[PDB]
């Protein structure tokens with residue numbers, strides 16, 4: 001089998017992407033944030049504290065003939081951005097772009113943190129990291145991908161995120177029309193539960209390529225590109241008027257400035273992020289100071305190839321017995 005679904009930016013800045021997901025019988029369609037950096041499929045629901053729901057579409061398990069309480073199961077998660085959610089668990093039928101998994105753990109939120117409430121466009125998350133990170137207790141649950149894997153034509157999914165435009169998540173096949181050149185595959189460590197790999201280096205604009213190993217994760221659920229302070233400083237030093245602002249919480253720059261591209265290495269191959277992808281707009285409405293899309297990972301404890309990087313590429317998440325990652329230009 002295969003599946004194919006369009007993913008759409010939630011706003012004009014590509015702060016995140018939402019993908020429609022069918023849950024239950026009859027289908028309840030929720031717009032979920034596909035997150036290769038986590039492993040829980042959780043949803044706003046009829047069980048979510050009323051004061052914490054503000055415009056989201058909710059899953060109502062009592063209206064699904066295929067929903068079953070996963071008796072005794074609870075979940076609780078906290079994300080890198082400080083957000084969190086928790087609740088109980090149902091199993092139900094879940095479909096993404098024509099691909100159906102029966103008995104998928106659907107984690108129903110009883111509580112969500114303010115950032116989730118405040119974002120009316122995201123109805124929940126669909127985790128696509130390794131199932132070892134799943135927070136369901138006492139019985140850890142499998143991701144949608146892990147459940148679908150054996151049925152897929154090939155045990156892979158692909159992320160093809162758009163710049164200020166929709167893109168595509170495919171399951172079970174590689175669309176050879178969706179990228180240029182060849183796909184370069186690179187090793188993955190699953191030891192921390194992430195799609196963790198090692199970039200071979202970077203270049204800033206037309207500058208010479210610096211060969212250096214940069215461990216990091218391929219994370220569709222993170223907006224920006226977070227890299228070591230050395231690398232990030234080298235980038236922003238090429239932008240007139242750029243500075244790191246403690247009050248704003250990262251590098252900012254005047255949008256009268258022109259942003260250089262940023263290149264990252266995948267083996268001997270190179271993915272080029274255009275300068276425009278690194279502009280995240282005014283720090284506040286009407287401000288002449290813009291927020292940068294490349295930021296320091298210092299303090300996070302890991303480098304993160306988030307949407308800024310991933311949307312410059314066609315990315316293969318290869319879930320074979322030995323997982324790997326593939327990157328192609330597009």
Ligand SMILES: CC(C)/N=C1\C=CC=CC\C1=N/C(C)C
Pocket residue numbers: 015223224248249250280281282283284291
């Ligand atoms: C890219 C997006 C998620 N973040 C921002 C986007 C625009 C403006 C200001 C700040 C900002 N993050 C700060 C709070 C660290």
